[PDB]
Design a protein around this nucleic acid. Sequence first.
DNA 1: CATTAGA
DNA 2: TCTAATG
Length: 327
Amino acid sequence: ETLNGGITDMLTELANFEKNVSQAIHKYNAYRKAASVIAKYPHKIKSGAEAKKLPGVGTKIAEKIDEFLATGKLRKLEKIRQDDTSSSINFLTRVSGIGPSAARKFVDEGIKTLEDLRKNEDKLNHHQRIGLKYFGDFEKRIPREEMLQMQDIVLNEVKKVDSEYIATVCGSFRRGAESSGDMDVLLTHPSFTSESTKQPKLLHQVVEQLQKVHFITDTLSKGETKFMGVCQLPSKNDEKEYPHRRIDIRLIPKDQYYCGVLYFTGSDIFNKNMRAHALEKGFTINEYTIRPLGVTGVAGEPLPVDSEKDIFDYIQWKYREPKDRSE
DNA sequence: CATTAGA
DNA sequence: TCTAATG
Ligand SMILES: [Co+2]
Ligand SMILES: [Co+2]
Ligand code: NA
Ligand code: NA
């Protein structure tokens, strides 16, 4: 956790560079299991060899580890940290809808910068087009102050469109979070569940709503169960307009909300931890359900949930306020 | 780990 | 269809 820090960090840098700049899935995949086990390691890694004893650590990594121990740096690392082509991918990559594939291809053609991107706005597709548009605002954290306002709005419409809707603003936001990255709205309705053959409009309707009034302003991608946009708070009696904000709306079969809802609320740790516990407690939990464990190894059989409660109850835990879903 | 675009 | 990107 800190005894093994710098080692794991360089390791992650290396890995990272492989998967992105180059296309070295293995090397890249290598760098991580390494960075994983070395991190589990309870003692101060004193040397290559020492590391080397590890599972996943070959001669190559060890070799780096030595140099890193030897001198606070790493050449290959300093070299990458330098290189423009590489630097460039790292950046272009920030643009929403720009992955590495595309990162590399752009570079290739010589689009290294943002400006470059603009001049060649033609080469960018709609998603990336928006990404480019809102580049600045896409990076900005969302203040809960704002979070509350947004949420208020969405809830309002959802309601008005259909009284039957059930919507949850999941994520950190849900968990107290002073800020948040984007807004995730968990949707479901009684007329949608496991079986009941869709009802795409169900999503469609509300989407429209939100756009209607100008809360949703763009569409990154909208499909039959997942919508992905950009929204924005009405810039008041002007002098101050609001930033463009990433926003996801997902339709859910009412017969799996709380699970999913549980799930999105997290934290990551609350998850796993709650997840590991359902196991002893004789269950299985995942993004949609909770199934009682059958001794023959596994077993199935979706347990019926009407609230986040139902789940804890099952695995007989203490009802944890989201607030304290932190770990 | 899955849903949407895209070409 | 495969392949990319976000989550
Ligand atoms: Co989020
Ligand atoms: Co999200
Ligand atoms: Na080894
Ligand atoms: Na990006």
